[PDB]
Design a protein around this ligand. Structure first.
Ligand SMILES: [Au+]
Ligand SMILES: [Au+]
Ligand SMILES: [Au+]
Ligand SMILES: [Au+]
Ligand SMILES: [Au+]
Ligand SMILES: [Au+]
Ligand SMILES: [Au+]
Ligand SMILES: [Au+]
Ligand SMILES: [Au+]
Ligand SMILES: [Au+]
Ligand SMILES: [Au+]
Ligand SMILES: [Au+]
Ligand SMILES: [Au+]
Ligand SMILES: [Au+]
Ligand SMILES: [Au+]
Ligand SMILES: [Au+]
Ligand SMILES: [Au+]
Ligand SMILES: [Au+]
Ligand SMILES: [Au+]
Ligand SMILES: [Au+]
Ligand SMILES: [Au+]
Ligand SMILES: [Au+]
Ligand SMILES: [Au+]
Ligand SMILES: [Au+]
Ligand SMILES: [Au+]
Ligand SMILES: [Au+]
Ligand SMILES: [Au+]
Ligand SMILES: [Au+]
Ligand SMILES: [Cl-]
Ligand SMILES: [Cl-]
Ligand SMILES: [Cl-]
Ligand SMILES: [Cl-]
Ligand SMILES: [Cl-]
Ligand SMILES: [Cl-]
Ligand SMILES: [Cl-]
Ligand SMILES: [Cl-]
Ligand SMILES: [Cl-]
Ligand SMILES: [Cl-]
Ligand SMILES: [Cl-]
Ligand SMILES: [Cl-]
Lengths: 172, 172, 172, 172
């Protein structure tokens, strides 16, 4: 019943709905990661807050995709949201590894949707991914890689803790 | 691995996890209702915004339950989130009916959790439901009932539209 | 006599001049639509103002294309501007239909210019259309589709008028 | 000589006086814990300040119970206050363990007073415990559990210190 649809393939429409699922699944993973770190026997509030903010960001990405689906005259379709892959998330290092794997999977999904958009000659879709997704994901993955290295440094050794503290207490 | 748990039954712990599922399912229903009203062939932005706000409120209720689960030393466990019951939501009247049915089901779930809390002599749980849930649900259901009556009045007849307009344009 | 031209095909240069014509023709259509709604026997000032603003937006798009033509070292060439397709525009519904047809034709022209830019390996042109045209057109076409649905709802029936008024007077 | 007493059992009146004793005993324990940490050979001022604030909070709880005793027309009766269980409090971990044991004992006393209030059909008493005691105790016990885990993490190992520092210096 759309009167607006133009140059918007059914292939991209379906891929957008799948990507909304993937972003909401990611948001739900981050909600689980955050509340795990809020447990009294884990009790790292900053890590809870880090993942709570990422749950928000992933929800917001899904909402942006849904708004765009309607802007193009496609039909938002929702599927079941699978529960996160784990119920307990181990150490901060374990959790940050799981997060980077998750973000890499979203980034690959964005790249696959660009490939589809390019094959379907859909420049509005490409511009949309560029405006709101591709560089956001690269920045977040770089931050997570930085965090993995610093966690690895801090937990690994005296030299590494000392080097971290110098950066923080003398330079910053 | 909790060192804090006191007077918190495994029955309530499990019921709280189920209620988190129900609230997140409700939030996901409201996300679908809102984006339906944002379709170009439906195009009632105020109804989209009404349900978008309720998606937020239901998410927030789930997050409050999860925070409380950790405060009591229970273990948050997440399950799959089923997709909403419909993909298209009909008219504003259809949608507001579906919303009141949904809110009634959450209210009954809250009342069942009070019954369990009372049976388990858990006054902190009871106080928690009173502080953040029971009156919030009654207020929202009353608002929805008011909206059902006004939608029914507006769509039904000339007399009803005229009466609505008098309230709005002469009295308010 | 340009000393700046680089990677700018004669094909794109010509297509840009044609697109300036199409945008100025659109602006002139909107000027006619707006003054039609200002007639004393039509007298819908809000519809006049809506189309007056679109006349401005289409002029501004043409001016942006002309600035870009000079930035690239092409030569702006102007042709005659044909008068709008009608002298009287019927009802608000008739007019909004004509507007969406017009905007669709501009959007297809933008997509055709992207195809040409891609074939000519001209990424500055592609970036220019993305920055200032493609999403602007999709947003405007979605707004127009929303308006068509609401006009259709309002003129069509009691149920539809009532539903519109609920959104506006109770929710907004 | 009360002219106001209504629905206030002698059982609850006595239990309230006992609970005032328990809260003042707790306040006195916290005063001893705080000044222990202020010793020059212990010298952890933040731990002194943490327990000094809890001494204040426990005094304030006792004063609230006494105000309520008079509001209901019962008679405040004071007994001797026993000295705290230890004269020296060991390490921060030892002290935080002793504190959580203390708070658990107050929480159980509050739950026992709810049981008595419910048996005596005294809803004002129940509302009073809900308003000012039950959730305050759960929040404080959760904070103490968080602190036990972080102390245990910090004192236990290199990995644990590193993880703590990451939360604090990189995330917070
Ligand atoms: Au969290
Ligand atoms: Au947090
Ligand atoms: Au692309
Ligand atoms: Au593309
Ligand atoms: Au630092
Ligand atoms: Au530092
Ligand atoms: Au520092
Ligand atoms: Au919405
Ligand atoms: Au909305
Ligand atoms: Au209850
Ligand atoms: Au209860
Ligand atoms: Au009104
Ligand atoms: Au009104
Ligand atoms: Au009015
Ligand atoms: Au006008
Ligand atoms: Au006007
Ligand atoms: Au292009
Ligand atoms: Au290009
Ligand atoms: Au309105
Ligand atoms: Au209105
Ligand atoms: Au109104
Ligand atoms: Au002190
Ligand atoms: Au102190
Ligand atoms: Au009670
Ligand atoms: Au009671
Ligand atoms: Au810190
Ligand atoms: Au720190
Ligand atoms: Au720091
Ligand atoms: Cl969280
Ligand atoms: Cl299903
Ligand atoms: Cl493309
Ligand atoms: Cl929404
Ligand atoms: Cl499963
Ligand atoms: Cl109870
Ligand atoms: Cl005009
Ligand atoms: Cl000529
Ligand atoms: Cl290109
Ligand atoms: Cl002190
Ligand atoms: Cl004595
Ligand atoms: Cl009672």
């Amino acid at each position: 019943s759309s009167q607006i649809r133009q140059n918007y393939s059914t292939e991209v429409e379906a891929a957008v709905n799948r990507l909304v699922n993937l972003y909401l699944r990611a948001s739900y993973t981050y909600l689980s990661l955050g509340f795990y770190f809020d447990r009294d026997d884990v009790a790292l509030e900053g890590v809870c807050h880090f993942f709570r903010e990422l749950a928000e960001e992933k929800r917001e990405g899904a909402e942006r995709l849904l708004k765009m689906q309607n802007q193009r005259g496609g039909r938002a379709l929702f599927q079941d949201l699978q529960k996160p892959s784990q119920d307990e998330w181990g150490t901060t290092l374990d959790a940050m590894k799981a997060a980077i794997v998750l973000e890499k999977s979203l980034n690959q999904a964005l790249l696959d949707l660009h490939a589809l958009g390019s094959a379907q000659a859909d420049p509005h879709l490409c511009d949309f991914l560029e405006s709101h997704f591709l560089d956001e994901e690269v920045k977040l993955i770089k931050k997570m890689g930085d965090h993995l290295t610093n966690i690895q440094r801090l937990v690994g050794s005296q030299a590494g803790l000392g080097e971290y503290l110098f950066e923080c207490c003398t330079l910053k």
